[PDB]
Write an enzyme that holds these catalytic residues in place. Structure first.
Site, PDB file in Angstrom:
ATOM      1  N   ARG A 215      44.014  36.045  55.563  1.00 21.45           N
ATOM      2  CA  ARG A 215      43.344  35.755  54.436  1.00 21.45           C
ATOM      3  C   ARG A 215      41.987  35.120  54.779  1.00 21.45           C
ATOM      4  O   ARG A 215      41.545  35.648  55.784  1.00 21.45           O
ATOM      5  CB  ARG A 215      43.936  35.124  53.299  1.00 21.45           C
TER       6      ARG A 215
ATOM      7  N   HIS B  38      62.216  35.988  62.810  1.00 24.60           N
ATOM      8  CA  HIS B  38      60.896  35.050  62.506  1.00 24.60           C
ATOM      9  C   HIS B  38      60.199  35.162  64.103  1.00 24.60           C
ATOM     10  O   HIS B  38      60.386  34.435  64.678  1.00 24.60           O
ATOM     11  CB  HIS B  38      61.162  33.780  62.299  1.00 24.60           C
ATOM     12  N   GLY B  39      59.154  35.884  64.192  1.00 19.61           N
ATOM     13  CA  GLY B  39      58.459  36.253  65.109  1.00 19.61           C
ATOM     14  C   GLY B  39      57.047  35.945  65.005  1.00 19.61           C
ATOM     15  O   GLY B  39      56.014  36.688  65.729  1.00 19.61           O
ATOM     16  N   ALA B  40      56.626  34.993  64.196  1.00 15.76           N
ATOM     17  CA  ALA B  40      55.204  34.890  63.577  1.00 15.76           C
ATOM     18  C   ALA B  40      55.184  33.454  63.673  1.00 15.76           C
ATOM     19  O   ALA B  40      55.702  32.677  64.210  1.00 15.76           O
ATOM     20  CB  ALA B  40      54.979  35.361  62.231  1.00 15.76           C
ATOM     21  N   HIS B  41      53.554  32.909  63.262  1.00 14.60           N
ATOM     22  CA  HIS B  41      53.465  31.742  62.900  1.00 14.60           C
ATOM     23  C   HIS B  41      53.312  30.703  64.278  1.00 14.60           C
ATOM     24  O   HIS B  41      53.236  29.373  64.123  1.00 14.60           O
ATOM     25  CB  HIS B  41      54.094  30.898  61.871  1.00 14.60           C
TER      26      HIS B  41
ATOM     27  N   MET C 159      60.616  30.160  53.088  1.00 16.25           N
ATOM     28  CA  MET C 159      59.924  29.040  53.074  1.00 16.25           C
ATOM     29  C   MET C 159      60.706  27.830  53.376  1.00 16.25           C
ATOM     30  O   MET C 159      61.349  27.457  52.515  1.00 16.25           O
ATOM     31  CB  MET C 159      59.451  28.892  51.403  1.00 16.25           C
TER      32      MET C 159
ATOM     33  N   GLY D 123      48.654  34.887  50.801  1.00 14.62           N
ATOM     34  CA  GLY D 123      47.322  34.853  49.742  1.00 14.62           C
ATOM     35  C   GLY D 123      47.608  35.759  48.737  1.00 14.62           C
ATOM     36  O   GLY D 123      46.278  36.321  48.161  1.00 14.62           O
TER      37      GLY D 123
ATOM     38  N   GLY E 224      54.550  33.379  48.334  1.00 14.15           N
ATOM     39  CA  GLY E 224      55.024  32.030  49.018  1.00 14.15           C
ATOM     40  C   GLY E 224      55.032  30.877  48.084  1.00 14.15           C
ATOM     41  O   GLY E 224      55.730  30.732  47.183  1.00 14.15           O
TER      42      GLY E 224
ATOM     43  N   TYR F 128      55.478  30.508  66.637  1.00 18.44           N
ATOM     44  CA  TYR F 128      56.700  29.911  66.963  1.00 18.44           C
ATOM     45  C   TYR F 128      57.080  30.633  68.309  1.00 18.44           C
ATOM     46  O   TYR F 128      56.437  31.321  68.838  1.00 18.44           O
ATOM     47  CB  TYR F 128      57.836  29.867  65.881  1.00 18.44           C
TER      48      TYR F 128
ATOM     49  N   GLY G  17      63.508  29.391  56.862  1.00 23.76           N
ATOM     50  CA  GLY G  17      63.827  29.491  58.347  1.00 23.76           C
ATOM     51  C   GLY G  17      65.027  28.690  58.664  1.00 23.76           C
ATOM     52  O   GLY G  17      65.121  27.745  58.271  1.00 23.76           O
TER      53      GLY G  17
HETATM   54  N1  LIG Z   1      58.443  27.973  59.553  1.00 25.22           N
HETATM   55  C1  LIG Z   1      57.090  28.670  59.227  1.00 25.22           C
HETATM   56  O1  LIG Z   1      56.857  29.842  59.395  1.00 25.22           O
HETATM   57  C2  LIG Z   1      55.882  27.925  58.436  1.00 25.22           C
HETATM   58  C3  LIG Z   1      54.793  28.847  58.147  1.00 25.22           C
HETATM   59  N2  LIG Z   1      53.671  28.228  57.630  1.00 25.22           N
HETATM   60  C4  LIG Z   1      52.450  28.451  57.677  1.00 25.22           C
HETATM   61  O2  LIG Z   1      51.380  27.644  58.813  1.00 25.22           O
HETATM   62  C5  LIG Z   1      50.460  27.225  58.258  1.00 25.22           C
HETATM   63  C6  LIG Z   1      50.808  25.591  57.918  1.00 25.22           C
HETATM   64  O3  LIG Z   1      50.670  25.383  56.631  1.00 25.22           O
HETATM   65  P1  LIG Z   1      50.703  23.695  55.987  1.00 25.22           P
HETATM   66  O4  LIG Z   1      51.588  23.548  55.134  1.00 25.22           O
HETATM   67  O5  LIG Z   1      50.595  22.853  57.080  1.00 25.22           O
HETATM   68  O6  LIG Z   1      49.129  23.659  55.084  1.00 25.22           O
HETATM   69  P2  LIG Z   1      47.993  24.882  54.992  1.00 25.22           P
HETATM   70  O7  LIG Z   1      48.656  25.947  54.371  1.00 25.22           O
HETATM   71  O8  LIG Z   1      47.604  25.338  56.361  1.00 25.22           O
HETATM   72  O9  LIG Z   1      46.656  24.102  54.302  1.00 25.22           O
HETATM   73  C7  LIG Z   1      46.677  22.975  54.077  1.00 25.22           C
HETATM   74  C8  LIG Z   1      45.475  22.709  52.859  1.00 25.22           C
HETATM   75  O10 LIG Z   1      44.468  23.797  53.016  1.00 25.22           O
HETATM   76  C9  LIG Z   1      44.365  24.418  51.709  1.00 25.22           C
HETATM   77  N3  LIG Z   1      44.048  25.767  51.801  1.00 25.22           N
HETATM   78  C10 LIG Z   1      42.663  26.035  51.673  1.00 25.22           C
HETATM   79  N4  LIG Z   1      42.531  27.641  51.875  1.00 25.22           N
HETATM   80  C11 LIG Z   1      43.807  27.908  52.412  1.00 25.22           C
HETATM   81  C12 LIG Z   1      44.323  29.006  52.670  1.00 25.22           C
HETATM   82  N5  LIG Z   1      43.922  30.451  52.646  1.00 25.22           N
HETATM   83  N6  LIG Z   1      45.725  29.235  53.119  1.00 25.22           N
HETATM   84  C13 LIG Z   1      46.495  28.318  52.935  1.00 25.22           C
HETATM   85  N7  LIG Z   1      45.901  26.709  52.973  1.00 25.22           N
HETATM   86  C14 LIG Z   1      44.575  26.633  52.251  1.00 25.22           C
HETATM   87  C15 LIG Z   1      45.504  24.525  51.104  1.00 25.22           C
HETATM   88  O11 LIG Z   1      45.523  24.509  49.650  1.00 25.22           O
HETATM   89  P3  LIG Z   1      46.985  24.866  48.784  1.00 25.22           P
HETATM   90  O12 LIG Z   1      47.583  23.601  48.704  1.00 25.22           O
HETATM   91  O13 LIG Z   1      47.637  26.073  49.401  1.00 25.22           O
HETATM   92  O14 LIG Z   1      46.171  25.143  47.194  1.00 25.22           O
HETATM   93  C16 LIG Z   1      45.847  22.858  51.631  1.00 25.22           C
HETATM   94  O15 LIG Z   1      45.384  22.036  50.800  1.00 25.22           O
HETATM   95  C17 LIG Z   1      50.074  27.674  56.975  1.00 25.22           C
HETATM   96  O16 LIG Z   1      49.569  29.080  57.143  1.00 25.22           O
HETATM   97  C18 LIG Z   1      51.584  28.358  56.579  1.00 25.22           C
HETATM   98  O17 LIG Z   1      51.676  29.531  55.633  1.00 25.22           O
HETATM   99  C19 LIG Z   1      54.152  26.349  56.764  1.00 25.22           C
HETATM  100  C20 LIG Z   1      54.709  25.949  57.633  1.00 25.22           C
HETATM  101  C21 LIG Z   1      56.227  26.653  57.899  1.00 25.22           C
HETATM  102  C1  LIG Z   2      55.576  25.073  52.621  1.00 23.82           C
HETATM  103  C2  LIG Z   2      55.708  26.538  53.336  1.00 23.82           C
HETATM  104  C3  LIG Z   2      56.779  26.694  54.098  1.00 23.82           C
HETATM  105  C4  LIG Z   2      56.845  27.979  54.863  1.00 23.82           C
HETATM  106  N1  LIG Z   2      58.143  28.341  55.421  1.00 23.82           N
HETATM  107  C5  LIG Z   2      57.980  29.387  56.239  1.00 23.82           C
HETATM  108  C6  LIG Z   2      59.231  29.881  56.976  1.00 23.82           C
HETATM  109  O1  LIG Z   2      59.970  29.127  57.085  1.00 23.82           O
HETATM  110  N2  LIG Z   2      59.281  30.888  57.687  1.00 23.82           N
HETATM  111  C7  LIG Z   2      58.225  31.859  57.583  1.00 23.82           C
HETATM  112  O2  LIG Z   2      58.429  33.053  58.159  1.00 23.82           O
HETATM  113  N3  LIG Z   2      57.104  31.740  56.740  1.00 23.82           N
HETATM  114  C8  LIG Z   2      56.998  30.291  56.136  1.00 23.82           C
HETATM  115  N4  LIG Z   2      55.774  30.150  55.435  1.00 23.82           N
HETATM  116  C9  LIG Z   2      54.855  31.039  55.176  1.00 23.82           C
HETATM  117  C10 LIG Z   2      55.036  31.967  54.090  1.00 23.82           C
HETATM  118  O3  LIG Z   2      56.481  32.528  53.961  1.00 23.82           O
HETATM  119  C11 LIG Z   2      54.127  33.209  53.905  1.00 23.82           C
HETATM  120  O4  LIG Z   2      53.785  33.520  54.856  1.00 23.82           O
HETATM  121  C12 LIG Z   2      52.862  32.591  52.992  1.00 23.82           C
HETATM  122  O5  LIG Z   2      53.165  31.234  52.402  1.00 23.82           O
HETATM  123  C13 LIG Z   2      52.636  33.698  52.081  1.00 23.82           C
HETATM  124  O6  LIG Z   2      51.200  33.144  51.381  1.00 23.82           O
HETATM  125  P1  LIG Z   2      51.188  32.632  49.838  1.00 23.82           P
HETATM  126  O7  LIG Z   2      51.991  31.283  49.959  1.00 23.82           O
HETATM  127  O8  LIG Z   2      49.664  32.364  49.509  1.00 23.82           O
HETATM  128  O9  LIG Z   2      51.984  33.759  48.944  1.00 23.82           O
HETATM  129  C14 LIG Z   2      55.793  28.856  54.533  1.00 23.82           C
HETATM  130  C15 LIG Z   2      54.693  28.458  53.726  1.00 23.82           C
HETATM  131  C16 LIG Z   2      54.781  27.283  53.187  1.00 23.82           C
HETATM  132  C17 LIG Z   2      53.494  26.830  52.401  1.00 23.82           C
END
Ligand SMILES: NC(=O)C1=CN([C@@H]2O[C@H](COP(=O)(O)OP(=O)(O)OC[C@H]3O[C@@H](n4cnc5c(N)ncnc54)[C@H](OP(=O)(O)O)[C@@H]3O)[C@@H](O)[C@H]2O)CCC1
Ligand SMILES: Cc1cc2nc3c(=O)[nH]c(=O)nc-3n(C[C@H](O)[C@H](O)[C@H](O)COP(=O)(O)O)c2cc1C
EC number: 1.3.1.42
Length: 366
Positions: free
Chosen positions: A274, A176-179, A23, A302, A323, A181, A55
């Site tokens: 999810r 990290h091979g997801a999301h 995270m 989730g 998370g 990047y 990360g």
């Molecule tokens: N380095 C990495 O790998 C990163 C992974 N990330 C992932 O990329 C996506 C970008 O996330 P974000 O921080 O830009 O916000 P996001 O999780 O997409 O959702 C923003 C809004 O939608 C809401 N939302 C309503 N459904 C949902 C739902 N199934 N799921 C994720 N939110 C929801 C969510 O409500 P919560 O705060 O989670 O309670 C929030 O208000 C996420 O899927 C995240 O897991 C974060 C950034 C770093």
């Molecule tokens: C604020 C934030 C930062 C995250 N940073 C990373 C990250 O750096 N690397 C990664 O693989 N996933 C990252 N994730 C995704 C989470 O590791 C994970 O896939 C997801 O949050 C799990 O869902 P949950 O929060 O409902 O348990 C991040 C998610 C959030 C919300």
């Protein structure tokens, strides 16, 4: 409670199956791990618990978020070591996630304002905006498509970072091979359109992740290497025309690496999208990937206490990573054991720079 039965992952015997998901929190000012990270990871470490760090940059050009920690300088290693020592003192296992953002960056995050690197020159669509160091949101620029020499040098950055993580005392690393990047920008056909050996066919688009995993396995051993993918997540335009076949192709290569190297990887980490009435279809895809991979499977995305309990009970996964609930519940493992109510998380302080506010000031159980 099946979440608290012992499980052996690699050479590590875990007391429970609750895993801290990696995270990004942006508290590592100037890309250097700070003491706040030491307090933050210590709050969540448990005896025999598995932690995955945020990360971590593998190179000066791998960042796409402000103040994310690195592992490519000796100064970062020494700062990382103090955090690992505190986590290990509580009897926990900790992996450092190696993270290259690829095209999901900005000139403000790149040396000399250079363009970020990727498999293609296609930029991320304007539907997505990148968080800026001042809290605003900017536009993703046009990335630079790297050749195969630069690809082998990025692979070299992964291998060099994995050794630095072991030098800092990390038990292992996660790739990290997801999301959406860098590695995902080679996997998904919605992005990868190269006409060379790294694009086109399904096997060609899997070459980059294969060579990265092969490099870190050869450097530190497969037992200390985890791999994270998300074929069914379209984050940052990471869309594949066949997510199931992509995941299966990735799994088959992980198997092949394990058969060739003679050892099993640490685990396979998969996050599901999810998001309705599509829960059965999304669970079938995750179970299909699990059944196809010879080794440990970590499910993410989730998950709750009951959803994680059932994930282990029906055998859908061996470990369950949490998370957001782990952000607001430092003793989340204890709260799952006792079935104590969980505290809510504040999204506004997810990516801020304050070392205590929204980071380490979430209370434990009274
Ligand atoms: N380095 C990495 O790998 C990163 C992974 N990330 C992932 O990329 C996506 C970008 O996330 P974000 O921080 O830009 O916000 P996001 O999780 O997409 O959702 C923003 C809004 O939608 C809401 N939302 C309503 N459904 C949902 C739902 N199934 N799921 C994720 N939110 C929801 C969510 O409500 P919560 O705060 O989670 O309670 C929030 O208000 C996420 O899927 C995240 O897991 C974060 C950034 C770093
Ligand atoms: C604020 C934030 C930062 C995250 N940073 C990373 C990250 O750096 N690397 C990664 O693989 N996933 C990252 N994730 C995704 C989470 O590791 C994970 O896939 C997801 O949050 C799990 O869902 P949950 O929060 O409902 O348990 C991040 C998610 C959030 C919300």
């Amino acid at each position: 409670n099946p979440l608290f039965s012992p499980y052996k992952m690699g050479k590590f015997n875990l007391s429970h199956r609750v895993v801290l998901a990696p995270m990004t929190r942006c508290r590592a000012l100037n890309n250097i791990p700070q003491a706040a990270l030491g307090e933050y990871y210590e709050q969540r470490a448990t005896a025999g618990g598995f932690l995955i760090t945020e990360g971590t940059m593998i190179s000066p050009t791998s960042a796409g978020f402000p103040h994310v920690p690195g592992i490519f300088t000796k100064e970062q290693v020494r700062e990382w070591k103090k955090i690992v020592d505190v986590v290990h003192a509580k009897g926990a296992v900790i992996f450092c996630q190696l993270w290259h953002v690829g095209r999901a960056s900005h000139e403000v995050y790149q040396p000399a304002g250079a363009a970020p690197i990727s498999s293609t020159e296609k930029p991320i669509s304007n539907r997505w905006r990148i968080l800026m160091p001042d809290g605003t949101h900017g536009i993703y620029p046009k990335p630079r498509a790297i050749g195969t020499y630069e690809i082998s040098q990025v692979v070299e950055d992964y291998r060099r970072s994995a050794l630095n993580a072991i030098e800092a005392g990390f038990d292992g690393i996660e790739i990290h091979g997801a999301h959406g990047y860098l590695i995902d920008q080679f996997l998904k056909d919605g992005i990868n359109d190269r006409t060379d050996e790294y694009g086109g066919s399904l096997a060609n688009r899997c070459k980059f992740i294969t060579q990265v995993v092969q490099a870190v396995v050869s450097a530190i051993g497969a037992d200390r290497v985890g791999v994270r993918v998300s074929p069914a997540i379209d984050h940052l335009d990471a869309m594949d025309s066949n997510p199931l076949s992509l995941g299966l192709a990735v799994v088959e290569r992980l198997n092949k690496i394990q058969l060739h190297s003679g050892s099993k990887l640490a685990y396979l980490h998969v996050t599901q999208p999810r998001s309705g009435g599509s829960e059965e279809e999304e669970a079938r895809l995750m179970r299909t990937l699990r059944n196809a991979y010879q080794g440990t499977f970590i499910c993410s995305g989730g998950y709750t206490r009951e959803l994680g309990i059932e994930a282990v009970a029906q055998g859908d996964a061996d470990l369950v990573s949490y998370g957001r609930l782990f952000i607001s519940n430092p003793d989340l493992v204890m709260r799952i054991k006792l079935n104590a109510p969980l505290n809510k998380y504040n999204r506004k302080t997810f990516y801020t720079q304050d070392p205590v506010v929204g980071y380490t000031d979430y209370p434990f159980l009274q």
